């Protein structure tokens, strides 16, 4: 067993900081154009998980 006797799925390290930005990898030969837009979500242990799932639905 590991020396650091923790639980399952516990965070290990600093909480990452969500940094709004943009990346554009232009390519004029592609007939289509794929775009992904996202905001900060909810963690596994957040008490507003199923609400986010409901909004996604």
């Amino acid at each position: 067993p590991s020396a650091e006797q923790l639980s399952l799925g516990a965070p290990r390290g600093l909480k990452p900081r969500f940094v709004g930005s943009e990346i554009r990898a232009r390519d004029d030969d592609s007939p289509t154009a794929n775009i992904a837009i996202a905001v900060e979500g909810m963690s596994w242990k957040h008490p507003d998980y199923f609400t986010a799932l409901v909004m996604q639905a």
């Binding site: 709004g20 930005s21 943009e22 232009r26």
Partner: protein, 87 residues
């Protein structure tokens, strides 16, 4: 609509009439995450110093010559119509 317009060199968004680009990655941040008034004074001072040292004489020479001939003309015109100038 239609109306079969003419030929231009601007177009619009989506088809701007430019050469095809490839492999140009671009990153930028959010205005709420970056900090205004960061490095403004240093960069502005360096740019102003470089511009003064670079362009410089291009403006310095003609304006200086014009001012010199202005002063000389005023002095000479004042002298000539005075007492001793006409003699």
């Amino acid at each position: 609509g239609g109306a079969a317009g003419g030929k231009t060199y601007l177009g619009w968004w989506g088809h701007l009439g430019g050469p095809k680009q490839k492999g140009i990655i671009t990153y930028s941040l959010s205005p709420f995450q970056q900090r205004p008034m960061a490095g403004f004074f240093k960069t502005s001072t360096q740019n102003m110093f470089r511009r003064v040292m670079t362009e410089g004489l291009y403006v310095a020479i003609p304006f200086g010559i014009a001012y010199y001939i202005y002063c000389w003309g005023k002095e000479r015109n004042e002298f000539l119509n005075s007492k001793h100038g006409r003699h």
